[PDB]
Amino acid sequence: ANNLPDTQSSGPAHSKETPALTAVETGATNPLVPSDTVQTRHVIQKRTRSESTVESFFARGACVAIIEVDNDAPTKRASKLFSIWKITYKDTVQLRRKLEFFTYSRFDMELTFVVTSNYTDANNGHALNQVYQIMYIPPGAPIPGKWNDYTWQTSSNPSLFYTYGAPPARISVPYVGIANAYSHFYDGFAKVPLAGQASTEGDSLYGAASLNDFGSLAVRVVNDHNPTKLTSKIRVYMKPKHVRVWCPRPPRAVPYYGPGVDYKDGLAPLPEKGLTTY
Amino acid sequence: NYTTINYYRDSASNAADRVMQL
Ligand SMILES: CCCCCCCCCCCCC/C=C/[C@H](O)[C@H](N)CO
């Protein structure tokens, strides 16, 4: 984040000290500077690594979900009057890759909700401004089965009531991990199968645990239905704040295939170029 | 001892290891 070191002038050298020659077998990166191999002038460095900080790298709102809801009528079976979305950053790739640069992370989160609505037909009248309810459902809490069941009382569940046309809604969340850091990767299982029990029992998905269980968001339109159908989409933008990260990893090189590290397609990411072609 | 005296102007007339980086 802070200023880089200056460059010191270097003249000709004739000595038994050989910074150029090293041994990478040790696993240590040679900390050479230009003045070690070539003659250098004095440069008072003014560049800084301020935008390379882990905070800056993640200080952007990244779309992570597009939740679709409808306001048509209870009778219509093809219209989804409410939508439940499991909270995760793995429905999108860009933030997922930036995060999976690191094994562990710990950060507060900022959720911004951009709601856009539209008509689906013209010859059924018009609609009044809609209010959307976004109810956070932590794991274990009752999940709505209908758009107007008791669960939406939100006596305890945090809930956001957004008026259409208002600026995108926004909330902040502290670090809510049950562990001391978020696990981008979990090399293990939630169950250990025990000798004796049937192959059906004890079988758990690889890499899946309750560390990444954060509940879901239930989104509905609070208004009663107008004689015409209205389709709305809530876009969720996640911004990490106060980011700490641990154990850097090589970034994803091939397309993601599911919530894990599985790959199936695009296994040839590199193009063809001659060895002696510039 | 011996004595020497010059009798002329012009003095011509007087009597007679392995690792290295460059
Ligand atoms: C006010 C009601 C709706 C809005 C409130 C929803 C709160 C949900 C926040 C806690 C769950 C998400 C916490 C962070 C998500 C992932 O773990 C991180 N991307 C991990 O890297």
Side-chain angles (χ1 to χ4, degrees), chain A residues 64 85-90 95 99 104-111 113 133-138 154 157-161 170-177 181-184 211-219 238 240:
Chain A
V64 290
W85 165 76
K86 176 76 194 71
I87 295 172
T88 180
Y89 60 86
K90 294 184 179 177
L95 178 62
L99 273 176
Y104 309 112
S105 57
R106 185 187 166 92
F107 54 78
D108 301 328
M109 201 180 61
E110 183 192 60
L111 294 192
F113 306 87
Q133 187 181 0
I134 305 164
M135 176 173 57
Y136 174 42
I137 306 176
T154 53
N157 280 341
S159 194
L160 236 187
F161 282 90
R170 172 175 276 176
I171 57 96
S172 55
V173 187
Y175 169 76
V176 300
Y182 291 134
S183 298
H184 301 158
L211 300 168
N212 58 283
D213 185 6
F214 300 116
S216 54
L217 303 184
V219 181
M238 181 181 302

Side-chain angles (χ1 to χ4, degrees), chain A residues 13-16, chain B residues 19-22:
Chain A
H14 190 132
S15 67
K16 300 177 290 185
Chain B
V19 190
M20 197 175 62
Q21 172 169 326
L22 314 177

